[PDB]
Amino acid sequence: LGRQLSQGRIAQLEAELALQKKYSEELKSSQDELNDFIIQLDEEVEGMQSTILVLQQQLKETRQQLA
Amino acid sequence: LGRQLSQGRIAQLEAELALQKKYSEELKSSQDELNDFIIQLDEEVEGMQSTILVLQQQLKETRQQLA
Amino acid sequence: ASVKLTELLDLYREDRGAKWVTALEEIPSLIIKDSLGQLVDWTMQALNLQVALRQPIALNVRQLKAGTKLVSSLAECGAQGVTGLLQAGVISGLFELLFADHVSSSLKLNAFKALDSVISMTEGMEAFLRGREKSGYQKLLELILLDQTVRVVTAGSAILQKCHFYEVLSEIKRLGDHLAEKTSSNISEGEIERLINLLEEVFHLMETAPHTMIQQPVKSFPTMARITGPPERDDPYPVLFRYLHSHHFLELVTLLLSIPVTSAHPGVLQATKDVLKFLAQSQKGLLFFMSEYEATNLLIRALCHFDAFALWLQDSTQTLQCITELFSHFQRCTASEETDHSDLLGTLHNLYLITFNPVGRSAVGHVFSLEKNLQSLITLMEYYSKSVAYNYACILILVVVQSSSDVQMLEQHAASLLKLCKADENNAKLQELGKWLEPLKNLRFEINCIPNLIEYVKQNIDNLMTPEGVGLTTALRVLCNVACPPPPVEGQQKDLKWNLAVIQLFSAEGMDTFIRVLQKLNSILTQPWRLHVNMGTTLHRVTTISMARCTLTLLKTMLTELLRGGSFEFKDMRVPSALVTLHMLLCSIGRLDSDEQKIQNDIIDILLTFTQGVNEKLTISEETLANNTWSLMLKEVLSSILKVPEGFFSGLILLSELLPLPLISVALNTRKLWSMHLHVQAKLLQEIVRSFSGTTCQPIQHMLRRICVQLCDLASPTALLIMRTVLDLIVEDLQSTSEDKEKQYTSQTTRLLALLDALASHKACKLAILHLINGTIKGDERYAEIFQDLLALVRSPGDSVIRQQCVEYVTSILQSLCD
Numbered sequence: 001l002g003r004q005l006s007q008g009r010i011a012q013l014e015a016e017l018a019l020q021k022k023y024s025e026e027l028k029s030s031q032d033e034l035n036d037f038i039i040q041l042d043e044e045v046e047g048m049q050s051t052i053l054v055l056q057q058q059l060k061e062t063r064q065q066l067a
Numbered sequence: 068l069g070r071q072l073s074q075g076r077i078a079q080l081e082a083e084l085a086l087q088k089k090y091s092e093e094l095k096s097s098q099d100e101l102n103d104f105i106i107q108l109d110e111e112v113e114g115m116q117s118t119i120l121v122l123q124q125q126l127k128e129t130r131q132q133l134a
Numbered sequence: 135a136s137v138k139l140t141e142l143l144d145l146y147r148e149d150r151g152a153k154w155v156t157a158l159e160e161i162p163s164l165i166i167k168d169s170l171g172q173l174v175d176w177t178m179q180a181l182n183l184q185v186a187l188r189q190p191i192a193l194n195v196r197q198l199k200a201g202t203k204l205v206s207s208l209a210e211c212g213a214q215g216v217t218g219l220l221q222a223g224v225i226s227g228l229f230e231l232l233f234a235d236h237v238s239s240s241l242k243l244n245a246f247k248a249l250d251s252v253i254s255m256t257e258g259m260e261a262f263l264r265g266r267e268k269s270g271y272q273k274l275l276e277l278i279l280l281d282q283t284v285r286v287v288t289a290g291s292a293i294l295q296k297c298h299f300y301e302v303l304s305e306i307k308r309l310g311d312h313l314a315e316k317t318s319s320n321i322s323e324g325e326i327e328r329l330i331n332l333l334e335e336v337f338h339l340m341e342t343a344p345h346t347m348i349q350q351p352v353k354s355f356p357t358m359a360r361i362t363g364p365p366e367r368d369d370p371y372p373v374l375f376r377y378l379h380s381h382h383f384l385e386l387v388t389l390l391l392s393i394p395v396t397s398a399h400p401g402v403l404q405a406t407k408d409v410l411k412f413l414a415q416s417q418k419g420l421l422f423f424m425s426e427y428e429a430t431n432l433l434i435r436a437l438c439h440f441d442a443f444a445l446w447l448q449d450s451t452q453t454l455q456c457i458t459e460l461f462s463h464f465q466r467c468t469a470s471e472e473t474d475h476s477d478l479l480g481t482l483h484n485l486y487l488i489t490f491n492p493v494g495r496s497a498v499g500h501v502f503s504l505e506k507n508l509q510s511l512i513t514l515m516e517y518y519s520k521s522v523a524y525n526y527a528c529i530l531i532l533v534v535v536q537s538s539s540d541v542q543m544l545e546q547h548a549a550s551l552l553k554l555c556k557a558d559e560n561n562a563k564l565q566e567l568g569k570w571l572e573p574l575k576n577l578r579f580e581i582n583c584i585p586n587l588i589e590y591v592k593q594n595i596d597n598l599m600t601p602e603g604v605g606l607t608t609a610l611r612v613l614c615n616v617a618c619p620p621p622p623v624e625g626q627q628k629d630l631k632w633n634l635a636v637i638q639l640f641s642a643e644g645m646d647t648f649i650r651v652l653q654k655l656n657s658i659l660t661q662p663w664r665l666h667v668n669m670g671t672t673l674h675r676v677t678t679i680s681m682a683r684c685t686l687t688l689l690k691t692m693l694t695e696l697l698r699g700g701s702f703e704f705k706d707m708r709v710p711s712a713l714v715t716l717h718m719l720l721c722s723i724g725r726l727d728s729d730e731q732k733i734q735n736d737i738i739d740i741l742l743t744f745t746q747g748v749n750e751k752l753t754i755s756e757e758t759l760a761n762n763t764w765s766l767m768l769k770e771v772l773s774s775i776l777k778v779p780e781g782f783f784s785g786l787i788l789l790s791e792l793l794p795l796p797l798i799s800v801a802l803n804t805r806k807l808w809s810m811h812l813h814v815q816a817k818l819l820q821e822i823v824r825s826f827s828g829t830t831c832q833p834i835q836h837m838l839r840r841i842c843v844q845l846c847d848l849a850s851p852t853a854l855l856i857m858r859t860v861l862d863l864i865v866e867d868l869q870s871t872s873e874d875k876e877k878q879y880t881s882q883t884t885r886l887l888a889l890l891d892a893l894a895s896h897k898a899c900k901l902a903i904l905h906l907i908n909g910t911i912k913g914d915e916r917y918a919e920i921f922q923d924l925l926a927l928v929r930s931p932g933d934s935v936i937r938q939q940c941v942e943y944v945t946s947i948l949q950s951l952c953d
Contacts, residue, residue: 074705074706075645075646075706078645078704078705078706079640079643079645081702082640082696082702083637083640083641085696085701085702086633086636086637086640086695086696087637089633089695089698089701090630090633090634090637093358093359093628093630093633094359094361094630096358096359097357097358097359097361098361100355100357101355101357101361101362104283104284104285104355107283107284108239108283111239111283115236118236
């Protein structure tokens with residue numbers, strides 16, 4: 001009755017939680033790696049932004065020179 | 068009493084699981100918002116390349132004007 | 135460094151290009167350790183877009199980025215730098231870059247940081263607000279309207295929030311000067327209410343200052359959870375204390391406490407004592423009081439001539455002065471040829487004399503717990519390791535370690551104290567100090583050390599509040615700041631370390647350990663109380679209070695995050711069964727004391743988390759309602775109240791604190807939810823009323839009446855049920871007397887009629903009384919019969935005194951019923 005239900009809950013629950021805790025940890029690690037990838041994406045983005053601003057400024061300098 | 072030990076062990080393991088899943092949720096939400104900010108940065112990049120293209124085109128027109 | 139700076143400055147007097155940019159990039163390192171005019175002239179040329187345009191690739195945006203770092207370095211040097219920067223036009227020069235076109239978001243985000251360092255001094259914010267021509271405030275207001283990225287609208291908001299704080303201090307000064315000097319009519323409640331309203335903004339803009347008034351790193355994004363950024367930050371408090379000093383805050387609080395009208399006002403005394411309490415909890419804040427030491431004494435007198443805040447402030451200031459003297463002694467006199475030097479003996483004697491009264495040991499152990507003030511005593515012992523200076527230092531360190539509860543000084547100094555205690559094996563004052571720092575043996579304070587501390591507590595749990603088991607007070611103080619975050623502040627970013635900390639706590643069996651700690655502490659103060667050790671010394675009381683507070687804080691931190699939004703259920707019925715007994719033992723006397731009250735608040739908070747985690751959909755099924763987290767907690771609390779004859783008055787206080795206040799969308803949501811769960815425990819709630827009705831005690835009776843009023847004000851069915859119970863008590867009381875003989879009236883009947891009269895005064899109880907006496911319900915004729923009996927008693931009075939009280943009570947009941 002109740003005792004058998006409690007024992008089955010104990011056994012199967014502990015087994016399957018122990019099994020899927022590892023996949024939960026894998027998910028955490030995957031999200032950490034994705035966050036790292038986002039970090040270098042951001043860094044590259046501001047690098048391109050600074051370089052492009054340099055290009056525009058030298059273009060405007062050539063503009064002021066020719067006119 | 069079997070119920071006390073059952074609820075204790077299940078509570079420990081399921082508390083671990085619930086806290087892990089929460090950690091995942093407020094990691095994913097932050098990652099999604101950071102992706103949105105990256106999309107904003109990309110929009111800036113594309114518009115800035117567009118003004119590069121416009122200014123370079125007008126460079127070619129004034130160069131052909133100068134001859 | 136100065137020689138190098140002179141050579142660089144003279145070499146590039148008129149040189150522009152790559153060498154000039156290199157010099158600009160190199161200067162900020164040199165300035166750390168009339169050249170000021172030339173530096174200012176250089177700074178205003180590095181911020182010019184007309185000079186950046188005329189430079190080659192990669193050299194034009196490195197000139198602009200290096201011109202916003204000379205501003206952040208020249209301004210921090212002193213007022214002589216900020217004055218020159220403002221005279222040169224840095225405020226307008228930093229807005230021609232933010233308004234310029236095609237500027238990247240990483241260079242606009244750097245110009246804000248240069249401006250944040252200019253308006254951080256009172257000479258700067260005066261020019262920012264009052265125009266020199268449009269001011270910088272108007273320009274920033276227009277800049278907000280323009281479309282910007284996520285990090286530029288957040289950086290411009292910090293400058294705006296800092297400007298608000300400067301303009302709440304300016305209106306306080308004008309309001310106070312007009313209130314005191316002019317009028318003392320105009321001193322009305324429509325004017326004082328502004329002062330209390332303004333003084334609650336100063337306390338609000340300084341509590342949230344670290345989060346809404348600092349400039350975040352360039353690579354940080356405004357997310358509610360902090361990811362992808364440098365861990366370090368900046369401290370805004372020195373700037374805030376620089377604004378408070380310039381406005382003469384302390385010279386004005388004394389004015390509000392020394393004027394005929396608002397000194398006697400209890401709302402202004404409390405408002406101004408909350409700013410002072412917050413300001414004195416930090417080393418910078420305590421040093422702020424001693425900078426203008428003359429104005430601090432007058433404030434102490436003003437607060438004192440009017441509970442022990444003035445004495446605590448005096449003790450803290452004296453302790454800080456003595457600590458500064460101790461540090462200064464070992465600087466001018468590097469070597470102490472005379473170990474018993476008169477100056478240091480006097481300093482130690484004064485410090486020792488402070489530590490007699492309990493309010494003095496709580497201020498000696500508080501100043502020594504900030505920064506590295508504990509190093510003076512350790513240095514004093516190490517120099518002399520007997521001399522009399524050694525004994526005083528040993529006593530003072532024992533006092534500091536025993537009393538202080540914020541154990542952060544132990545993360546660095548625990549290595550020196552342990553070896554010093556090992557060195558002297560014959561001193562009775564060091565053999566005890568080494569027992570307190572027993573768990574701190576090769577421990578590094580991070581999350582990885584939590585299992586070790588929990589293991590130590592689990593092993594040495596048998597010895598609590600015994601001479602050998604004094605390391606449990608420190609093993610629980612250390613564990614309570616590693617894993618327990620401070621109370622949240624609006625505008626915060628949720629750091630993710632705190633979730634991992636709670637996961638580690640649950641993994642390392644924190645739940646069972648803390649429950650065992652609470653149970654063991656409970657079964658010392660009640661059953662082993664026969665020794666009657668009722669806080670004979672200040673150690674047994676402070677230690678017990680600290681253990682209780684630390685365990686409660688850990689329990690609350692675990693249970694709040696675990697039972698956050700009802701995602702997971704909780705059925706362990708041990709926490710809401712030993713919090714009642716702890717309340718009975720400790721919080722038995724309001725409580726006040728600033729420590730006995732917080733325990734009650736924490737107990738109520740822990741009990742309340744069982745209600746928030748509720749299911750709003752499964753509110754109909756009997757199984758889902760009689761086996762909910764709400765119902766189990768309520769059953770445990772109600773059963774706990776009715777188990778000890780001595781634990782009734784304290785239990786009624788707990789029940790009153792649990793229930794909502796007596797009588798929009800959220801108000802009805804909780805009130806009707808409370809009545810739905812209360813309906814299940816009908817037999818338990820009915821037992822409270824009947825059991826406590828047959829007793830004679832004024833506080834117990836008043837608490838019972840208050841609880842009845844609250845439960846009636848909850849919702850309608852509960853009020854009707856309570857009225858059924860009470861009128862049934864009336865019915866049985868009047869049926870106890872045989873109708874064959876003359877009716878017998880006792881004092882219990884008088885108390886019951888008084889209870890009916892007290893209940894009938896409330897409209898919520900009035901409607902239930904009317905509904906019950908109307909007899910609409912089937913089987914409701916008995917209540918009509920008892921009302922007829924009361925009416926017949928009214929029609930047939932007597933001469934007995936008890937009959938007189940009965941008649942007056944029934945007449946009052948009828949008078950209330952007629953209304």
